């Protein structure tokens, strides 16, 4: 049964690796988006 859990860990690692690779590929260019402003907070004397 130890071989089965070793294969479990290996499969989870491979899935995490491919998911991280896809995330890195996606993060290079964000998708086009449009929304409201969220204006910057004013600065005060302090």
């Amino acid at each position: 049964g130890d071989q089965r859990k070793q294969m479990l860990q290996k499969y989870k690692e491979e899935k995490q690796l491919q998911k991280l690779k896809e995330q890195r590929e996606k993060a290079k260019r964000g998708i086009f988006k449009v929304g409201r402003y969220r204006p910057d907070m004013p600065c005060f004397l302090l």
Binding site: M41, F44, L46
Partner: protein, 430 residues
């Protein structure tokens, strides 16, 4: 001159402030729209002609209760910039109220406080209203109080807090926030008044025979307490108590600034006729362990200093008689190093009654604020709950994920432990 600024943080603080300002408007004759058809200069600033704006500020990370104020019957009393509103609630999280959500709203409320403080010329101090349980009322209150400490400095800081009850509490993650906020309140506060909701409930059930009281009665009682606190400054009396004198007489050591407030006589209309409410008997009822608004036992505690604030038809001689009778009672004991431990304040004007309120009109009223060691037991079981929940690291991630570490959890724990040790070693005989 002789002004003080009220700060209301959290839902509890905002509702208590609503009750307080309704009571103040009733006291000074100011209508809810601000027009009065002198002594009101303490809490209200006169703008232009026939317009009084309270020297207050309302802060929340959620828009429910603030917008309730903005649409309520007192919407004309406050200007919109006085009521500051966030977008997302702290959600019972000290981390959220202190680091993530409190950082982008602290600057604006401090600017409002600055613009409200330079307007007055005799600022006595600040009145911060909050609760220990809430994430906003803990985290943002701690942040605002440390900013006020670093900004104003020697100005007095008086805060009113809703300490959690031993058994009556409505938040699961409450002890974490309660420990964390006190960890900074120990050094950024000058006098922290303590109130338990369960004790208000017990007083309402017994004295005012209300079978189903809700938060409005609690806020009315707290508003009466704060009005009795500020009456010596908003009016004239035989013996006047100022905030600085209050702190000097009530706080013996810098870390010991957590007195317990009691108010008397708090009775219904039908029970008032049969009672000849004398000064001596209300003074005795102040020391009754059933009338404390903190769920604790003064009998197993030891008194260190108490301030007696009288308002109404009260002359000093019967006050001296009542105090002398109190001294002769063995059930109420005081520390040896405080041979005289009574600060006396008499005010001529009687406490007013809010229309629709449960309290009855009384000729005399007493608000005693005693700094005693009975709150060591309160700190003790709050700390036991904190330890018992922190052993399993429950809810810790809900704070760690918001710019916060376990190391300061432990440091707040040991700071509280040092606090109980301080109370224990000041309560011993010499």
């Amino acid at each position: 001159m002789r002004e003080c600024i009220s700060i209301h943080v959290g839902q509890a603080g905002v509702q208590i402030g609503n009750a307080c300002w309704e009571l103040y408007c009733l006291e000074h004759g100011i209508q809810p729209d601000g027009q009065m058809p002198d002594s009101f200069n303490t809490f209200f600033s006169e703008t232009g002609a026939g317009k009084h704006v309270p020297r207050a500020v309302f802060v929340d990370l959620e828009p429910t209760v603030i917008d309730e104020v903005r649409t309520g019957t007192y919407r004309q009393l406050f200007h919109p910039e006085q009521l500051i509103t966030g977008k997302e609630d702290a959600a019972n999280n000290y981390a959220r109220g202190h680091y993530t959500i409190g950082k982008e709203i602290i600057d604006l409320v401090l600017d409002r406080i600055r613009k409200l403080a330079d307007q007055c010329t005799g600022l006595q101090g600040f009145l911060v209203f909050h609760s220990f349980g809430g994430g906003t009322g803990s985290g943002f209150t701690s942040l605002l109080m440390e900013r006020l400490s670093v900004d104003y400095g020697k100005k007095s800081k008086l805060e009113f807090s809703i300490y959690p009850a031993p058994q009556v509490s409505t938040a699961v993650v409450e002890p974490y926030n309660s420990i964390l906020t006190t960890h900074t309140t120990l050094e950024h506060s000058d006098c922290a008044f303590m109130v338990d909701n369960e004790a208000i409930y017990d007083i309402c059930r017994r004295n005012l025979d209300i079978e189903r009281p809700t938060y409005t009665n609690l806020n009315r009682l707290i508003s009466q307490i704060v009005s009795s606190i500020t009456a010596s400054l908003r009016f004239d009396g035989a013996l006047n108590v100022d905030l600085t004198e209050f702190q000097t007489n009530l706080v013996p050591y810098p870390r010991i600034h957590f007195p317990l407030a009691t108010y008397a006589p708090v009775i219904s209309a039908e029970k008032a006729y049969h009672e000849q409410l004398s000064v001596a008997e209300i003074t005795n009822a102040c020391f009754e362990p059933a009338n404390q608004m903190v769920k604790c036992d003064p009998r197993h505690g030891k008194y260190m200093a108490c301030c007696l604030l009288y308002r109404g038809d009260v002359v000093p001689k019967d006050v001296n008689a009542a105090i002398a009778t109190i001294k002769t009672k063995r059930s109420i004991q005081f520390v040896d190093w405080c041979p005289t431990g009574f600060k006396v304040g008499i005010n001529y004007q009687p406490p007013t009654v809010v229309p629709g309120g449960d309290l009855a009109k009384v000729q005399r009223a007493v608000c005693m604020l005693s700094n005693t060691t009975a709150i060591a037991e309160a700190w003790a079981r709050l700390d036991h709950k904190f330890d018992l929940m922190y052993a399993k690291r429950a809810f810790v991630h809900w704070y760690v994920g918001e710019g916060m570490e376990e190391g300061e959890f432990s440091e707040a724990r040991e700071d509280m432990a040092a606090l109980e040790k301080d109370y224990e070693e000041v309560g011993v005989d010499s």
